């Protein structure tokens, strides 16, 4: 499945769609003990760097929580936050911001 899940404004809540994507990664991870993923949290530009750094961390941790709760070994997961510092779209509208509020699933 895809390796990115998105979030709403000032929120670290996951949608039903996101759960489907995450369940696929959980299965792969539980089936491949040598695989490990880095979960990186991100935010759009609104708000201070410190506020976004923490929000990004809550997002990465929410994804982490879903995976662990589903049965994934914590050793195969690492969560980190980049806050607003690594946007995929530097635009200044919802279209751009929606792309930035995310958690990326990176293998290895």
Number of Cβ within 10 Å of residue 9's Cβ equals: 11
Which among 81, 3, 79, 10 is positioned nearest to 44, based on CA atoms?
10
Q: Which residues pair with 5 in a beta bridge?
A: 103
Asked whether 78 and 37 are in contact (CB, 8 A), the reply is yes
Domains of the chain, CATH where assigned: 1-108 (3.30.1330.60)
User: Bridge-partner residues for 48, per DSSP?
Assistant: none
| Runs of H (alpha helix) within 32-93 | 49-69
Backbone angles phi, psi at 79, to 5 degrees: -115, 135
- The two tokens of residue 67 are 């995976």
Closest to 60 (Cα-Cα) out of 50, 71, 52, 48: 52
Q: How many CA atoms lie within 13 A of 58 on its CB side?
A: 15
* Method by which the model was determined: X-ray
At 37 the three-state DSSP class reads strand
Instruction: Write out the two tokens for 40.
Output: 């990186």
Helix (H) or strand (E) holding 106: strand 102-107
- Dist CA 90 CA 105 (whole Å): 21
């Amino acid at each position: 499945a895809k390796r990115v899940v998105h979030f709403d404004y000032d929120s670290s809540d996951l949608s039903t769609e996101d759960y489907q994507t995450l369940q696929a990664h959980a299965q792969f991870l539980m089936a491949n003990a040598n695989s490990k993923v880095a979960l990186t949290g991100h935010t759009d530009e609104r708000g201070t760097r410190e506020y976004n750094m923490a929000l990004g961390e809550r997002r990465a941790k929410a994804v982490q929580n879903y995976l662990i709760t589903s049965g994934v070994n914590p050793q195969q997961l690492e969560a980190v936050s980049y806050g607003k510092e690594a946007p995929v779209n530097p635009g200044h509208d919802e279209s751009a911001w929606k792309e930035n509020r995310r958690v990326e699933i990176n293998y290895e």
